[PDB]
Design a protein around this ligand. Structure first.
Ligand SMILES: Cc1cc2nc3c(=O)[nH]c(=O)nc-3n(C[C@H](O)[C@H](O)[C@H](O)COP(=O)(O)O)c2cc1C
Ligand SMILES: Cc1cc2nc3c(=O)[nH]c(=O)nc-3n(C[C@H](O)[C@H](O)[C@H](O)COP(=O)(O)O)c2cc1C
Ligand SMILES: Cc1cc2nc3c(=O)[nH]c(=O)nc-3n(C[C@H](O)[C@H](O)[C@H](O)COP(=O)(O)O)c2cc1C
Ligand SMILES: Cc1cc2nc3c(=O)[nH]c(=O)nc-3n(C[C@H](O)[C@H](O)[C@H](O)COP(=O)(O)O)c2cc1C
Ligand SMILES: [Fe+3]
Ligand SMILES: [Fe+3]
Ligand SMILES: [Fe+3]
Ligand SMILES: [Fe+3]
Ligand SMILES: [Fe+3]
Ligand SMILES: [Fe+3]
Ligand SMILES: [Fe+3]
Ligand SMILES: [Fe+3]
Lengths: 398, 398, 398, 398
């Protein structure tokens, strides 16, 4: 509960949660919502928690400090998972001044509908004295991931409250990074970036470059989700630079949907052709109807190339492929190559429309693979050869 | 097990099945696969069963008749749920002649890869004598629902083996229509047509008109799924004509997806505005992430108008909406009106792209509804008014 | 929104909800939460809504009437789906007197932890004048379904606010029973009683007998879930008497779990043996792993007999069967007969323990059916014969 | 495809599979089925594949070798996932002699119903010459995991075909252990043992001791699921000894079910009390209704102690807890301690029956924790204290 000195974690662990953003981001290891109470000469509260825990939040905050003793409230991000307990709290201390970006005023009002609250706009470099020789330095970070996002730096203790950035949805009773299981931790960090931060990778390097340019010490990075980076904090920062640079491993992801397993047979063959041709490559196969969507996108993120599959259904693609291609267009993956494939009954046409959309999504397209009905021994030889040819074209230098 | 005289049901009931066409058609009441053995002077087998039951099928067929005694095999439709036990059967009696459409030869080979089988092409009006003054009259029905589809008429007994047409996925131990629960039966008939036959409605009336033009008596209609229409057979035929004529009731369906329930609030308000304005209208609301997709499409089929909802996510629609719009484009609903709506955070743009695609799908578009963040009391008044205005524009004549 | 005269519906429709009591009661047609505002000389609020809609509730109540104008609050049932918006409301009007049973004081405090609230204990026959010649007559109904449950009768308008009783989870924009789809309505009424009220059937007839013994007119029955019974109200009352009397139709339900489909094959055979022997009987088969649990229990409720299936796994039953038998023990079905069956590999023992527990649950047991590994043609003949023998033993009089 | 010298992998990768043993074992990374063709002077086939891939299996085996050239068939285990393609294969070469345990004859017949097949019973130490100075030495391993289980040792090449043992459900295009991701590999090995092999741990050490007592070299261990242990084979053997010895880490697992989140609140508090008292302990919390069951059991396996939770529902436990306790009784965990807890409304009684059953399952019981309705601040202090007290009682020596 105690982060460092007079900084107190007053957040909420959520072991049961599985759905975020509707069902667009599934969290298989639950999550946590970090809120930090800093008490020097001035008592300042940094962010709240998910709206589902508003009652537990206020009550727990009472057991920590009398509400009237809170001087300032800092809101880095106005999304419901961080500002959901704000209305219930401001109902007890309505006159308390809030500090946020100009855009946050727009987003906070859009959620809580209380424009009378004492908002105080802050910009990059702005400071807020809190006594004892310590102050809060604000750093705007628009579109990382919302127009309203920012970060708060605490002088002296050298703590960077980054909110969503550098966070991960991984529920644990221990607070610090060196206290949890390392593999599960990093698997969750990468899952987060790939499914939410990918479309804004271009802003990451310049932003991180700017922050470092302030020559500020960082003993800890305290995110709004998961662990506090206490042990070797820049650790997670180095990763974000790596991830933001059109990241890719020697990996190929293959996903598809199928009605009678014909496209599946093509997928399996293509894989065998790849694994047989280039041993360095790690291959993954997924049925979009029977798989975790976020796991597919994480792999895609980690991949140098992708093969998407679909049969023709009513002159169009299959719904789950159409939807998954829509999401990829939004995530805008970069410097990746792709190939479409599928089976059909008579007129077909789904592989062609799938191929065009993959290209508009930003993928560098290779030749498509097409089969009629169920691939017989001859057709399967073609599918394996397609796997080999793809493996040669995409092969990394020796 | 006995249908009529020397016609024996030798199919397979499937109580456990939930998924068809991958997961594109969910069957909540299971299904059945009808195969009919006709024994006069010639023993003829009409269709087989799903590939998953190939072992049980052959064995049960042995207990009915020695395989060598089967003279002819009739294949109306070469989809795996009806011809899946064909390879395992033809391995015992390889020389047995098969009767089907020219397209069926292409589709059967595409599945079983046995081009050596003794195929015999049949066309509309063709006959196959089976002794005792009875014969089989074939009726081609391409694209109902496959290019290979046809129907078989048995003279004397006046039995029409229609295969998929007039069928429904409803598992019951009783075979005849008058023996099962009527409401569940018809609910399943309508669910079938809406999710599979809608795109081919234009072919239904001419086809049914043609068959009736043959002046043939019909004592029974024996489909490949579900009950045998024994009691008042034309019953289901009258329905298909009704359904094929751009069918619609005084009903409005509203579906959407949402990340923080903002679009949900708009949907609820719109509904209240409709119900309050026009009591004749039946309203339905669905969250595509939390609902049965086939149930949504059935309602859409039954509806005169639709309101589709979505928020903006990464400059695009939400995946499940994009996918569901893709499927509707394929099903090609006709003479229906629609309206797009949704919330957004800053730039938006998802409602506009949703509206265009709905139009390209064949919907007559009305004004869109847009809100920013969470709709406050003022915004909610607009959403209800949108419901009222829509209800007036779409209202049926007094 | 207007029920009758000065009685105003101020509840909340819930189209999206699927889970109740964790996941023990799935609601496939959503639900609604009814709250009624009665305004004569005294303004009285009857129940609130689900805690998830506390914000929308208070706000909507403001748009209806100023909170200070509310004189009394009536709480028939203190479960979260009806009293979840009570804390948020009492925070605005803390001095407002509450009327409930003695047990409700215990249950309301156990949820809200505000023992200072002005509680007023009421008993059967107690009245509360509200002006204009009208008063509220209270009727305690403990264990229907909670120790705290009661009903409120409004004189003059003749409205019986029964809360949970006579309700159903069926979300619709129309409020009155004669305005909704009748089949869906009754299907939901029966689903409710079977899954929640079965264990307390013995209390239903005496309670309903008592209420009628008050010689009070009932123009409407306004439940807390779903429609208001406006058209022929006693309709639903007659049903409850029917349902409470160890209800059963000429129906047999068969459910089981299976690892390799051996027990499934036995189930299918048994069914064929039943349907072949006694045509009057309606048969239903369910795989507990692939089916809606509440649908299974509804059928069981409607059934005269049950056949539960399971294979032996690690010397014990299968989990989902063990769990489902645990729930049945709690629901305490009466005057029903049952038979256990299943397959095993070597030592077995699961059918025997399943049979004993079914008996302790209150089922009158018949002979068990046992098979080793996969039932061959001989074993299948035994399984069908078991179906026939069961069908004869349980047959209703001619 | 080539394992070593004249040993050819001819199995089947299954990327899509999610369900095993009905739904009792969920496989989130798919699986594979290993079949090995050994060709010296005698051509011998070791096991087949899952029945779902019988067609692909035979066909692929044809492309490898003419069926008539197969001299012997070895069946280590007669479960459908390894002998499912046996009927379809024996239909082509009916006279081929089969080698298996006496119990396998019983289990193979129970599945395939072909008692005429040329079975040849083998016992531990039995040999089967295959030419070129190499022979097959058989090692019976009853109840690991079936009465029919055995292992086959190939002289010269020093390959131990262990079947299920040492296997894992982890689908990959690479065959050898040193070629796959190590963490995912071991996570799957442990998941397998915990969910299937736990009840037979007592037989593992004596069996492995016996095999090593034969003084046979092992260059490779070729299982029937997943990778071939090529690099440091004894690796997985050392683990099994570790796992079989009533394995436990410094870990505590907490699972429960809940209807209104009361028991959840108790669970969260207990955890906080543990983490606060003993930092060495890793804590895990699961909602049985919202979690992967196999993941829960894996943790339980890894745990020194467990806290199971449940509220009272209809005088009994909650179904999913009852079912999960039934399965644990079957898995028979050893040398673990446990504590029951839960909330109730009036009479309660579920915690007491849960506690007794946990004890009969083999857990050493601690004091139970009980609360009424929703735990207020006082009750929560008790729940945390319960966490502390448990943490002290179960603490490992300094
Ligand atoms: C509902 C349905 C609709 C179909 N629509 C088309 C179509 O529009 N054009 C076409 O060429 N084939 C169509 N087909 C045939 C399939 O594309 C063909 O069977 C294909 O081989 C199946 O591929 P899959 O098993 O990998 O899903 C359709 C099949 C089904 C079941
Ligand atoms: C992951 C994510 C991506 C978003 N992308 C956009 C966007 O590209 N443009 C925009 O205007 N708003 C965007 N938003 C803001 C949402 O559209 C806004 O919060 C909206 O009110 C939510 O609607 P809903 O709760 O009905 O889903 C995004 C929100 C999230 C969570
Ligand atoms: C994981 C597992 C555990 C088993 N445990 C037992 C057992 O304890 N006693 C027994 O006689 N058979 C046992 N069996 C064998 C099964 O009961 C046998 O295969 C049965 O026919 C399967 O029935 P089902 O396919 O209907 O589920 C077990 C099988 C499996 C897969
Ligand atoms: C359907 C149902 C049945 C119940 N049955 C009992 C009961 O038999 N005995 C009892 O003391 N409480 C009973 N209760 C009350 C609950 O046990 C009580 O609300 C408890 O605090 C809920 O715990 P949970 O939210 O953790 O699930 C029942 C509650 C429900 C909803
Ligand atoms: Fe965020
Ligand atoms: Fe966040
Ligand atoms: Fe079809
Ligand atoms: Fe069909
Ligand atoms: Fe209730
Ligand atoms: Fe209720
Ligand atoms: Fe096995
Ligand atoms: Fe196995």
């Amino acid at each position: 509960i105690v982060v460092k000195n007079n900084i107190h974690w007053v957040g909420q662990r959520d072991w049961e949660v599985r759905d975020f953003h509707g069902t667009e981001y599934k969290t298989l290891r639950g999550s946590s919502y970090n809120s930090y109470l800093i008490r020097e000469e001035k008592n300042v509260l940094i962010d709240t928690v998910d709206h589902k825990f508003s009652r537990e939040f206020v009550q727990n905050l009472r057991n920590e400090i009398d509400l009237a003793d809170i001087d300032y409230i800092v809101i880095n991000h106005a999304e419901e998972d961080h500002a959901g307990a704000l209305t219930e709290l401001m109902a007890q201390i309505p006159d308390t001044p809030i500090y946020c970006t100009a855009n946050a005023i727009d987003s906070i009002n859009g959620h809580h509908h209380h424009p009378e609250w004492n908002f105080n706009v802050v910009k990059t470099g702005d400071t807020l004295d809190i006594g004892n020789g310590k102050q809060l330095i604000f750093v705007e970070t628009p579109m990382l991931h919302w127009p309203d996002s920012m970060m708060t730096y605490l002088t002296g203790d050298a703590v960077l409250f980054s909110n969503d950035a550098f966070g991960q949805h991984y529920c644990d009773e221990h607070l610090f990074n060196d206290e949890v299981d390392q593999t599960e931790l990093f698997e969750q960090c990468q899952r987060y970036y790939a499914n939410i931060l990918t479309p804004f990778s271009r802003l990451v390097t310049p932003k991180i470059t700017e922050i470092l340019g302030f020559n500020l010490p960082v003993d800890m990075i305290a995110t709004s989700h998961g662990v506090v980076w206490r042990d070797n904090p820049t650790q997670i920062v180095e990763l974000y630079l790596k991830w933001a640079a059109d990241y890719q491993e020697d990996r190929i992801t293959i996903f598809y949907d199928t009605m009678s397993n014909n496209t599946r047979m093509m997928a399996d063959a293509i894989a065998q052709g790849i694994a047989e041709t280039d041993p360095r490559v790690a291959v993954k196969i997924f049925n979009v109807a029977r798989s975790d969507k976020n796991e597919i996108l994480t792999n895609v993120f980690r991949s140098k190339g992708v093969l998407v599959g679909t049969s023709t259904m009513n002159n169009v693609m299959m719904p789950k492929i159409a939807g998954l291609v829509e999401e990829m267009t939004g995530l805008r993956f970069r410097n990746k190559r792709a190939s479409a494939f599928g089976s059909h009954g008579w007129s077909g046409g789904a592989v062609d429309r799938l191929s065009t959309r993959l290209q508009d999504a930003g993928f560098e397209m290779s030749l498509s693979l097409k089969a009629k009905w169920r691939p017989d021994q001859d057709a399967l030889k073609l599918c394996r050869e397609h796997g080999r040819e793809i493996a040669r074209q995409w092969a990394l230098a020796p």
